[PDB]
Amino acid sequence: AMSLENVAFNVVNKGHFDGQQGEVPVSIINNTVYTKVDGVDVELFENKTTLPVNVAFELWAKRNIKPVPEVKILNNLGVDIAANTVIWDYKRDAPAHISTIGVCSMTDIAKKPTETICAPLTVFFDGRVDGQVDLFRNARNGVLITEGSVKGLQPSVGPKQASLNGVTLIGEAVKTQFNYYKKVDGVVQQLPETYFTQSRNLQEFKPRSQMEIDFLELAMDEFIERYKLEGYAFEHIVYGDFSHSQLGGLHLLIGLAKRFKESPFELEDFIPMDSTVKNYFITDAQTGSSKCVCSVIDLLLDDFVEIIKSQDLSVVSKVVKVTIDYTEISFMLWCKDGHVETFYPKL
Amino acid sequence: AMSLENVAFNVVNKGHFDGQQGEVPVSIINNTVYTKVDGVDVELFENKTTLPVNVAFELWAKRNIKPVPEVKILNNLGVDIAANTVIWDYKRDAPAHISTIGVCSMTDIAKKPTETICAPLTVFFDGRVDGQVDLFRNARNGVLITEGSVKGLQPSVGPKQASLNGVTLIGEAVKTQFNYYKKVDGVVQQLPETYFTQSRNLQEFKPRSQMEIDFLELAMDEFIERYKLEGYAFEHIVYGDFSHSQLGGLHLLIGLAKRFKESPFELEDFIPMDSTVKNYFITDAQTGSSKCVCSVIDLLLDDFVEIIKSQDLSVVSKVVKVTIDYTEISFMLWCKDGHVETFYPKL
Amino acid sequence: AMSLENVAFNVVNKGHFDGQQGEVPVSIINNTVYTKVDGVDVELFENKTTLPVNVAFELWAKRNIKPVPEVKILNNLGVDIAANTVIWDYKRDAPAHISTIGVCSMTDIAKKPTETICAPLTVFFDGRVDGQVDLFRNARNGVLITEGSVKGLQPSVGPKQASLNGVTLIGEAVKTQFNYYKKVDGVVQQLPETYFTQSRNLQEFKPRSQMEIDFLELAMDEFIERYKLEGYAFEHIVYGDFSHSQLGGLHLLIGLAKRFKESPFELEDFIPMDSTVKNYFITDAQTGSSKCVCSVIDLLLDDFVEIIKSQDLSVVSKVVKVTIDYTEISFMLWCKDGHVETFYPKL
Amino acid sequence: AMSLENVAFNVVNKGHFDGQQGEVPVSIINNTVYTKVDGVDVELFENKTTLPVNVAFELWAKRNIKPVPEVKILNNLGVDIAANTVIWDYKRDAPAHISTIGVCSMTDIAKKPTETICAPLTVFFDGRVDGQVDLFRNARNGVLITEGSVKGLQPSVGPKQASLNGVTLIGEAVKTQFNYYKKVDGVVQQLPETYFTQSRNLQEFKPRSQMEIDFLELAMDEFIERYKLEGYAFEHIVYGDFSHSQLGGLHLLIGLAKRFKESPFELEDFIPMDSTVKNYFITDAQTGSSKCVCSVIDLLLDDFVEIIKSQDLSVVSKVVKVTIDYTEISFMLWCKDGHVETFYPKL
Amino acid sequence: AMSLENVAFNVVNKGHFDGQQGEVPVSIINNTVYTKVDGVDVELFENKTTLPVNVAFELWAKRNIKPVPEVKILNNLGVDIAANTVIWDYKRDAPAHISTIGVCSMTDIAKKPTETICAPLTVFFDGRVDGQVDLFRNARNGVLITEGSVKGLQPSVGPKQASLNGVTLIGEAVKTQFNYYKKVDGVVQQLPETYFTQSRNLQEFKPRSQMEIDFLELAMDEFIERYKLEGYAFEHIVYGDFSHSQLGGLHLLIGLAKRFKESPFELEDFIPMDSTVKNYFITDAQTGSSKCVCSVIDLLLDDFVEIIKSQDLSVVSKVVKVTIDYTEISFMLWCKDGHVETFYPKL
C-alpha cells in the first residue's frame, strides 16, 4: 500500500523510494515536506513543481536513479510518458512528464502500458528492465532504449553521455550509450542520422577533441589558419564580437567557455529547461556588450566545422536544416562574396 | 500502518477514522486536503488550526464522536491532555489539547498514560472505555468521567448536557450526564459544589424552567413583581438598558435572547473559544446603543436569582466568588441604599 | 510604543485598540493572527485585504467604533483619506482608504493633516473629535462632519442613518445624522441638494413610510391606483417581470423585498463593494427568469415616485441625472405615447 | 492592450518586455509565474517583492535593460520615481521605486510626468530617451542623466561605472558615465563635489590604481612606508585587527579583499540593499575574531588616502563630513598625540 | 516590552537582538519579515522552520553569537533545551531545540531553569554566563560547559573547534575548547573517553596532521606502504572504489576530499542535519559510479588508523563500538584471512 509516511521512511533510510516497509512522522507546511528526527523537524523536500506537494514528493522519491537519456532527447523523440518509472527533470526541478503509468495513484492514467488510454501516446520503454522490450514490441507508439541489440530491430546509436541523478556524464563504470528504437502507429521507424549536443556546462567546460583543445589554448588567428577556416566567419560565429553595445555572434558553447576563462560574465537563462538550442540574456561584464536573446548550441567543434564546411556559400540568405539530437534545427546562413557573414540557429 | 491515505479512506467511507484498511488518492494544497472521486477533486478538510495540515487532518479524523464534556468544563478542571482520544474543540475548530497520548506520531508525547512524561500532567480518562478507570486509579494527576458509579470514589454530578459531534445537547437516547472525579498529586480530590452554565445558543434559545418561560413571555414589570425581584436591579443587569450610547447591563444570555426576539442585533465574539464567561462586542441595531466588552454568562435564571438573593446588600462594593462550572467566578456587586446597583461578572 | 503584541493585547481585553499597556503572545500563520489563551491558540483576525497581515490587523484594531458615514457617502464626496482614524469598510472587509494619517507607521503618509503631502488630498475630518473643525478650517481640501452647527459655515444635512461597527442604523441612543461640509482648493463648497439611499438589506427589509407599507401589503393594481402611477411603468420598473427567460425591470430594492417575502431567489454580488447603485446577477428560483446585470438602487419609494413624476414624459429616450448620495446618477428614460416604457439607472 | 499573457509571451521570446504581440498560457501558483512549453510547466519568475505576483512580474519584465545609475546613486539624489521606465533593484530583487509613471496600471500614479501628482516628487529622467530632457526642463523636481551635454545646464560628472542588467561595470562598448542634473522646486541645483564608491564585490575584487595593486601585493609595513601612512592608523582602519574576540577596524572593502585572499571569512549582509556605507556581521574563520556591525565603504584607496591626509590631526574626537556618492557621510575620527587612533564611518 | 518591531529594530541596527530600545516598521508576507528603509521594503528574515514566521524571527534574532558547541555534540549529550539562550542550528536553518527557557513567550515552557517543568529535562548551561554554574550545580539533569575549571567537578575536555555564527572554527582570538560536565538525576556523571569528529567541509578541506598532509599529497600505494597500512583495506575503506556501478567504500571525509581535488562529484545530503555520521547519495561524475547511502564520518586520519589497528583481526564479522563525539558509533568489521575486508559505520 502506497503511503506518504512509507515514502518518507524510504527517503530517510535510502535517499529514494526502494519499496521498503516502515513509517516515519511527516509534516507538510508551505510546499515543504518535513520529518521528525529526534524531536526536531528536518526538511526532506521542497516542492518546486506545479503539482501538489505530496504528489510531487512521491514522484521525486520514485525517480529513476539509473542512467537515463537527457530529457531533451526524449522531447525530441516525442516521448509523452514513461512506462513504470519517473524521469525527473533536474533542469526544471519537476517530473519530465505530466502523467505516469503504474507509479502514483494521483497521476497514473493506467497501471500498465498495454491499456487502451496509452495506445495513442508515445511511451518510453527501458530495455534494462525485464519485460519492457516485449512491451515495446507490442506497443503502438513508443521509444525503446537498450544497452545492446534486440532481435530483428536496427538500432540507432545515441549520445555518448546520459543523465545519472541529475549529473550528465559519459559512463565508465556504467553504460550511458543506448540504442534507440521508435515505433509510430505500430510501424518501426528508422531514426534519422543526427549530430548530438555535448551537454557540457559553461563553468566546468572540458574539451573532447584535439581541435577543442587547440581552440581553448590557441589564439584566434592561429586557430583560424590551422584549420583553414578563413572564409567561415568563426571570429563572429564562434568567438563572439564584444565591440558594440549589442553582442555579436557567439552561438557555440565553446566560445562562451573561451570568453569565460578570459573574462567572467553572466547568462540569464530566462526559460530554464532542457533544449538542443538554448537562449540566453548575455551581458559581458568586461565590455558591457549585451544581447537580449542569444541562441547557443553545444556541438562538438569538429561537428560544427563539418556542418559549416558542408554548406553552399553561393546563396545570399537561406535556412539550413540540420538534424541534431533526433530533431531538425534551422540555421540562418548569410553569405556575401563567397564567404559567410553569419550562421546562427533560428528561433 | 498509520497513513494519510488510510485516514482519508476512513473519512471518505465512514466520515471519521474507524481503523478500516484501504487507501484513496490524496492531494494537499493550501491547508486543504483533497481526494479524487471519479476523476475530480473533492475537499475533505480545511485546516483552521496552527498545526500542519496533515497532522490536523489526522487529529480531526480521530476525534471522539461519543458525547464528551464541553471543553470549558475540561479547562476549568485543568485537563492538560486526553488519554487515547482526541477532544475536538468545535468553537476553535481545532483540537482541544496540544499533545496527545497514543493517537498521532507527530503529536504524541507518550503511547500510554502510564509513561513518566504524563505523570505531572492532568490526564482526561473516559470511564466508558475499558480499562480507563484503572488507569485513573493508578494515575497521579487526572480527571475521570463515568456514566455510573465507581467503587470507592464519591462522584461529582456534572452538567446535564454534553457535546456530541460539536452540538451541545441533553441526551435522551444517550447519556450526557457524567460523574466527575479528580486526582491531584495522587490524592483523590473533593470537587466543590457548583452551578453549571446551560451552554445555550442565542439564536435558538429555549427556556428550561417555568421561570424562564415567564421571563420570555411576560413583560418587565409583571415578571419583576411575580418573583419579588424589586430590589435586585434586574431591569438593568438582566433586561439591559438601551437608552444611552453605552449599553447598560445585559449580562445574562436569557436577556440577550429576550432582546433578540423583538429586535435582532450584533454579537462580535472577538475571542472565539469556550468559556464560562463570554465577552462580546455588542451593538444594538434598533437604538445604536453599544458596549465594547459585555461579559455574558448563561446560567439558569433560577440559579442566578438564587445567587442574587443570597447576597449581602449592606456592602457598598465587593467581589463575589461564585463556583460555576467547577471554577471560581468573580462578580462585582454594587449595592446602594440596600438595593443592587449592578451585579456583573468580573474580567 | 506601537507593537503587534500590544495591539493584540488591546484586542483581547477590549475588542479593539484602546491604547492600554500590556502584551500578549502572538502567532502569525497564513494571513491569520493567533494569540495563545491557556496554552491554546485562538484566532483573532483573518486578513481579507491585500495588505500584509500584521498591517491589516493593526488597521482593523484601530477602526472607528463611533457612528460614521457609510463608505459610499465618503466615496461620493471624494474623500481620499481620514484624519487620525481608520474607516473600516465592512462590505470589502478592508480599510476604506489605502493611506492613513497618524495611525500606522507602515501606512501613514503623514502624522498630521496639516503636512504638505496631505494638502492636495481630500481629508475626512470628524467634528466629534476636538480640534478637527479647526483642522478643516485650515485645510485646503477636506470634508467635515459634525453633530451640530459650526460657526460661519452652512451645513448640508446628511443621511438619517450611519454605520456603527459595520451595522447601518438610524440612531436613537446615539446621533447618526451629520452636517456635511466640503472644501475644494481652500474654498468652502455648497453641497448640492440630494436624495439619500436608505441602505437597507434585502432579507430584513423594513418600510420607512406609509407608502412602502402599502406597497408591501397590497397587490399591484391597488397600489398603482391608490397613488395614480398608471402611466409610470411601475409594473416593470419596480415590481419586476418574471415571464421571460430574461428578467425584466426590478430596479428598486423594495421590489426585490416584495418578491423575496413570497418567493426567495439568488443574488450574486459580483462586485462586493459599497455604492449608490448596485449591480447583481439575479436568478429567480420560482420561474427561472434571470438577468446578468440588474442595477438596483434603494431609494425611499416616496422619493422615487417624486423622481418619476418630475420627468418630462414626452421625449422618447433621454438620460436624466439625479443627485443621489451627493453624486450624479444617470437614469435611462424610455417613454412611448406619453407613458413610461422603462426607467433604469445607467451603468 | 496590456496583458499578463502578452507580458509572458514577450519574456519567453525576448527575455524582457519588448512590445511584441502574442500570448502564451500562464499559471500562477505560490508567488511564481509559470508558462507551458510543450505540455510541461516552466517557471518564468519568482516573486521576491512585497507586491502581488502578477504586478511584480509585469514590473520586472519592463525593467530598464540599458545601463542605468546604481540604485544608491538615485537614492542619494532623492529620486522618488522614474519617468516611463522601471529601475530594477537587483540587490533587493524588487523594483527600486514603489510607484511608476506610464508603466503598469496597477502601480501608476500618472501616465505622463507632467501631471500634477508628479510635481512634488523628484522624477528620474533619462536623456537617452527622446523628449526626456525637455520634460526635465519643464519639471519642478527631478534628476536628469545624459551621455553628453545639454544646452544651458552645467553637468555634474557622475561615477565611471553603471549598472547593466544587474551587473555593475565600467563600459567600453557602451557608455556608463553620465552627466547628472538636479532641480528642486523648479530651480536647477549645483551638485556638490563628491567622491564615488567603486561598487566592487569581495569575491572578484580588482585593483583600479597602482596604489591598490601595491596594497594587494605588498606587505603591511612595506606599503605603509612606501606611501608614508605612518601616523594614519592604516594597520587598524584598513588592514583590520584579528587578535581580540572583537574584530578591529577593517572599514575599507580593499582590506576585506586583502584578508579574503589569505583566509576566507563570513559576511552577513543583514540589511540587503544598496547604500554608500554597508553594515556587515563579520566573523573571521581563521581566528574567530568577529564584530556584529562592521561598517564598510568601497572607496578607491587613493581617494581614501586623500581624505585621511586632508584631516586635522590635532582634534581629539570629531565628526568628519565627506561628500561621497552625492551624499554626506559622517566619519568618526579619533586622534591621539598627533596620530590617528581610528577613522570609521558613523552608524 | 518584548515586541516584534523592537526585535526588528535591534536586527536592523545591530544584526541581532541586543536589548536596545526602538521600533521599526515591519511587514509580514509569506514567511518573510520585511522592514521599510526609505520607503522601500527590505527583507530581514525568511522563515525556513516549522514555527510561525514571527516566532522564528524572534528566536533567530536572539541566537547565541558567542562560540557554542556544535549541535551534534549537544544531541549526543542529550540536551533537550538551553537555559536563557537560543542555539541556532545552521544546518537546519532552525532553532536547535523546540522549547526555550526565558526567551520567547510563544515558546517558553519556563522563565528559569529552576522551575519544576524543567527538572526532568537535560538543560544546557553556559559557564561563560554568570550564575549558570550554580544553576547547573542545583539542577537535576543538565550539561555544563566552561572555559576553565569549576571547583569540585572533573572536566571532560571537548572538541577543539566550536561554532560561531554558523561557521565552525578552532579559535585563536576566542576560546572554542570547552570543559563538559553532565548530571543525570542529580548525580554528576563521568563522561566517557571519546574521539571527536573534525567537522571539516568537503570543498575547503584542510589537513590537520602530518599524516593527512601525506595522504593528500602522496599516491595511494606510497601512503599505504608508509604507515604500514597493508592489511587494513584502506584502498576500499578510505580511497574509494570507482570501478563498478555501485560505489565502493569511501567512508572517511578525507578520502572524499582527495577524490574531489582530482575530480569533483555530487553529494546529495538527503537528511540535512548535524550528525556524527552523515549519509550521502554520492554519484561520481568522472566514472558514473554511485551509491545511494554512503556513511561518511570526519575523523582525524590518525585517530581512524588508531581505531582500525586497535581491532581484533581474527573475527570474521562483528560490530565494533567506538565512542565518538560522546556517543557510541557501531562499525561493521569484515575480515578474511587475517586482513580487513571492509570497516564502515553501521546504518
Q: How far is Cα E112 from Cα B292, in angstroms, rounded to an integer?
A: 37
Given a contact cutoff of 8 angstroms between Cβ atoms, the answer to whether A147 and A129 are in contact is no
User: Coil, strand, or helix at residue E47?
Assistant: coil
Confirm or deny that B342 is annotated as ligand binding.
Answer: yes
Could you say which of B1, B26, B106 has the minimum Cβ distance to residue A54?
Answer: B26
Q: Give the gap in angstroms from C-alpha B86 to the nearest C-alpha of chain C.
A: 15
User: Residue with C-alpha cell 590604481?
Assistant: D209
Q: How far is Cα C264 from Cα C212, in angstroms, rounded to an integer?
A: 19
- Could you tell me if residue C212 is left (phi over 0), alpha (psi between -120 and 50 degrees) or otherwise beta? alpha
Given a contact cutoff of 8 angstroms between Cβ atoms, the answer to whether C57 and C93 are in contact is no
| β-sheet with B327-336: strand ranges across | B317-324, B327-336, B339-345
Dihedral sign of CA atoms D94, D100, D103, D106 in order: positive
Task: Choose, from C236, C258, C278, C336, the residue flagged as catalytic.
Answer: C236
CA dihedral D294, D298, D299, D302 (to 10 degrees): 90
Confirm or deny that C335 is annotated as ligand binding.
Answer: no
Q: How far is Cα E112 from Cα B200, in angstroms, rounded to an integer?
A: 43
- Would you state the cell numbers that stand for residue C39, as one nine-digit string? 496554552
Task: Choose, from D97, D251, D258, D278, the residue flagged as catalytic.
Answer: D251
Beta carbons within 10 angstroms of residue B131's beta carbon? 11
- Would you state the cell numbers that stand for residue A217, as one nine-digit string? 589554448
Q: How far is Cα C39 from Cα C49, in angstroms, rounded to an integer?
A: 29
Task: Say which experimental method was used.
Answer: cryo-EM
Q: Give the gap in angstroms from C-alpha E25 to the nearest C-alpha of chain B.
A: 25
Q: How far is Cα B330 from Cα B324, in angstroms, rounded to an integer?
A: 10
Q: How far is Cα D110 from Cα D112, in angstroms, rounded to an integer?
A: 6
Residue ranges of the domains in chain A?
Answer: 1-65, 66-191, 192-347
Q: Give the gap in angstroms from C-alpha C34 to the nearest C-alpha of chain E.
A: 10
| Interface residues on E facing C, Cβ-Cβ cutoff 8 A | 1-6, 23, 25-29, 34, 36, 52-55, 105-106
Contacts with A317 (C-beta within 8 Å, 6 or more apart), sequence order: A332, A333, A334, A335
Contact flag E65-D290 (C-beta cutoff 8 Å): yes
List gaps in chain A by the residue before each (C–N > 2.5 Å): none
Confirm or deny that B292 is annotated as ligand binding.
Answer: yes
Given a contact cutoff of 8 angstroms between Cβ atoms, the answer to whether E259 and E296 are in contact is no
Q: How far is Cα E260 from Cα E258, in angstroms, rounded to an integer?
A: 5
| Interface residues on C facing D, Cβ-Cβ cutoff 8 A | 50, 52, 116-117, 120
E162's enclosing H/E stretch is strand E161-164
Q: How far is Cα A38 from Cα B137, in angstroms, rounded to an integer?
A: 32
Report the relative pairing of strands C40-46 and C32-37 from DSSP bridges. Answer: antiparallel
Nearest to C65 by CA among C97, C31, C92, C90: C90
Contact flag C173-B245 (C-beta cutoff 8 Å): yes
B305's enclosing H/E stretch is helix B301-309
Subunits next to A (3 or more Cβ pairs <8 Å) are: B, D, E
Long-range pairs of C144-147 with CB within 8 A, sequence gap ≥ 24: C144/C180, C144/C181, C144/C182, C144/C183, C145/C69, C145/C178, C145/C179, C145/C180, C145/C181, C146/C178, C146/C179, C146/C181, C147/C175, C147/C178, C147/C179
Task: Choose, from A236, A244, A278, A336, the residue flagged as catalytic.
Answer: A236
Subunits next to C (3 or more Cβ pairs <8 Å) are: B, D, E
Query: Closest residue of E to A34, CA-based?
Result: E50
Long-range pairs of E184-190 with CB within 8 A, sequence gap ≥ 24: E184/E122, E184/E141, E185/E140, E185/E141, E186/E140, E186/E141, E188/E153, E190/E154
Contacts with D298 (C-beta within 8 Å, 6 or more apart), sequence order: D197, D198, D199, D200, D252, D253, D254
User: Residue with C-alpha cell 528536518?
Assistant: A42
Residues of E with catalytic function: 236, 251, 291
Residues of C in contact with B264 (CB under 8 A): 204
Q: b/e per residue, E307-318, with b = 16+ CB within 10 A?
A: bbeebeeeeeee
- Residue of C6, C9, C26 to mutate for E, most E C-beta atoms under 10 A: C26
User: Coil, strand, or helix at residue B164?
Assistant: strand
- Would you state the cell numbers that stand for residue D140, as one nine-digit string? 519642478
Residues of E in contact with C6 (CB under 8 A): 3
Residues of E in contact with D94 (CB under 8 A): 40-41
Residues of E in contact with A44 (CB under 8 A): 270-271
Long-range pairs of A257-263 with CB within 8 A, sequence gap ≥ 24: A257/A200, A257/A202, A257/A205, A257/A216, A258/A215, A258/A216, A259/A284, A260/A202, A260/A203, A260/A205, A261/A216
Contact flag C54-E27 (C-beta cutoff 8 Å): yes
Nearest to A52 by CA among A102, A95, A112: A95
Q: How far is Cα B283 from Cα B266, in angstroms, rounded to an integer?
A: 5
Could you say which of A2, A23, A28 has the minimum Cβ distance to residue B28?
Answer: A28
Q: How far is Cα C329 from Cα D31, in angstroms, rounded to an integer?
A: 40
User: Residue with C-alpha cell 564585490?
Assistant: D201
Q: How far is Cα B222 from Cα B235, in angstroms, rounded to an integer?
A: 12
B132's enclosing H/E stretch is helix B132-138
- Would you state the cell numbers that stand for residue A294, as one nine-digit string? 542569444
Q: How far is Cα A176 from Cα B347, in angstroms, rounded to an integer?
A: 75
- Would you state the cell numbers that stand for residue E286, as one nine-digit string? 568522472
Query: Closest residue of E to D97, CA-based?
Result: E40
Given a contact cutoff of 8 angstroms between Cβ atoms, the answer to whether E192 and E182 are in contact is no
Contact flag E4-C105 (C-beta cutoff 8 Å): no
Q: Å resolution of this model?
A: 2.5
Long-range pairs of B328-337 with CB within 8 A, sequence gap ≥ 24: B329/B276, B329/B277, B329/B297, B331/B307, B335/B311
Contacts with C108 (C-beta within 8 Å, 6 or more apart), sequence order: C99, C100, C101, C102
Q: What is the DSSP letter of D161?
A: -
C259's enclosing H/E stretch is helix C253-262
Q: How many CB pairs under 8 A join C and E?
A: 56
- Would you state the cell numbers that stand for residue B182, as one nine-digit string? 479528580
DSSP string, E201-224: -STT----SHHHHHHHHS-HHHHH
Contact flag A42-E271 (C-beta cutoff 8 Å): yes
E266's enclosing H/E stretch is strand E266-268
| Interface residues on D facing A, Cβ-Cβ cutoff 8 A | 11-16, 18, 27, 29-30, 34, 37-44, 65, 67, 164-165, 167, 169-174, 176, 204
Nearest to B25 by CA among D88, A190, C211, A109: A109
Rounded to a whole number of angstroms, the distance between the first and last alpha carbons of chain D is 48
Contact flag B288-C11 (C-beta cutoff 8 Å): no
CA dihedral D137, D140, D144, D148 (to 10 degrees): 20
Based on the number of CB atoms within 10 Å of its own CB, is E241 exposed (0-12), middle (13-18) or buried (19 or more)? middle
- Would you state the cell numbers that stand for residue B110, as one nine-digit string? 507518550
Q: How far is Cα C57 from Cα C50, in angstroms, rounded to an integer?
A: 12
Name B267's bridge partners: B282
Confirm or deny that A345 is annotated as ligand binding.
Answer: yes
Give the count of alpha carbons within 13 A of C80, CB side only. Answer: 14
- Would you state the cell numbers that stand for residue D316, as one nine-digit string? 581629539
Contact flag C176-B268 (C-beta cutoff 8 Å): no
Residues of C in contact with E5 (CB under 8 A): 2-4
Q: How far is Cα D341 from Cα D158, in angstroms, rounded to an integer?
A: 33
Q: What is the DSSP letter of E235?
A: I
Contact flag A167-E266 (C-beta cutoff 8 Å): yes
Confirm or deny that B291 is annotated as ligand binding.
Answer: yes
User: Coil, strand, or helix at residue B281?
Assistant: strand
Contacts with C141 (C-beta within 8 Å, 6 or more apart), sequence order: C119, C120, C121, C122, C123, C183, C184, C185, C186
| Interface residues on D facing C, Cβ-Cβ cutoff 8 A | 50, 52, 116-117, 120
In this structure, chain B runs to a length of 347
Give the count of alpha carbons within 13 A of B156, CB side only. Answer: 22
Contact flag D52-C52 (C-beta cutoff 8 Å): no
Given a contact cutoff of 8 angstroms between Cβ atoms, the answer to whether B150 and B181 are in contact is yes
Confirm or deny that B55 is annotated as ligand binding.
Answer: no
Confirm or deny that A335 is annotated as ligand binding.
Answer: no
Q: Give the gap in angstroms from C-alpha B119 to the nearest C-alpha of chain E.
A: 11
Task: Choose, from A183, A251, A258, A278, the residue flagged as catalytic.
Answer: A251
- Would you state the cell numbers that stand for residue D20, as one nine-digit string? 511584441
How remote is the C-alpha of A12 from its chain's centroid?
29
- Could you tell me if residue C306 is left (phi over 0), alpha (psi between -120 and 50 degrees) or otherwise beta? alpha
Given a contact cutoff of 8 angstroms between Cβ atoms, the answer to whether C191 and C182 are in contact is yes
Q: How many CB pairs under 8 A join A and D?
A: 83
Q: What are phi and psi of E262, to 5 degrees?
A: -80, -35
Residues of E in contact with B120 (CB under 8 A): 116-117
Nearest to B145 by CA among B72, B211, B73, B86: B73
Residues of D in contact with A49 (CB under 8 A): 41
Q: How far is Cα D196 from Cα D126, in angstroms, rounded to an integer?
A: 20
Q: How far is Cα B4 from Cα A105, in angstroms, rounded to an integer?
A: 14
Given a contact cutoff of 8 angstroms between Cβ atoms, the answer to whether B193 and B323 are in contact is yes
Query: Closest residue of E to D266, CA-based?
Result: E167
Q: Give the gap in angstroms from C-alpha A151 to the nearest C-alpha of chain D.
A: 34
Query: Closest residue of E to B53, CA-based?
Result: E50
Residues of E in contact with B99 (CB under 8 A): none
- Would you state the cell numbers that stand for residue A289, as one nine-digit string? 556588450
Contact flag D40-A96 (C-beta cutoff 8 Å): yes
Residues of A in contact with B59 (CB under 8 A): none
Give the count of alpha carbons within 13 A of C180, CB side only. Answer: 29
How many contiguous H segments (helices) and E segments (strands) does chain A have?
9, 21
DSSP string, D56-69: HHHHHHTB--S-B-
- Would you state the cell numbers that stand for residue B307, as one nine-digit string? 445567587
Q: What are phi and psi of D253, to 5 degrees?
A: -65, -30
Which residue type is seen at C174?
Answer: V
Nearest to C41 by CA among C22, C57, C26, C54: C26
Q: How far is Cα E220 from Cα E259, in angstroms, rounded to an integer?
A: 11
Based on the number of CB atoms within 10 Å of its own CB, is D62 exposed (0-12), middle (13-18) or buried (19 or more)? buried
Distances (CA, A) of A192 to A182, A319, C8, C279, D266: 11, 19, 71, 63, 54
Residues of E in contact with B50 (CB under 8 A): 52
Task: Choose, from C251, C318, C321, C339, the residue flagged as catalytic.
Answer: C251
Q: How far is Cα C214 from Cα C229, in angstroms, rounded to an integer?
A: 14
Q: How far is Cα C120 from Cα C142, in angstroms, rounded to an integer?
A: 9
Task: Choose, from D236, D258, D309, D336, the residue flagged as catalytic.
Answer: D236
Q: How far is Cα A315 from Cα A313, in angstroms, rounded to an integer?
A: 6
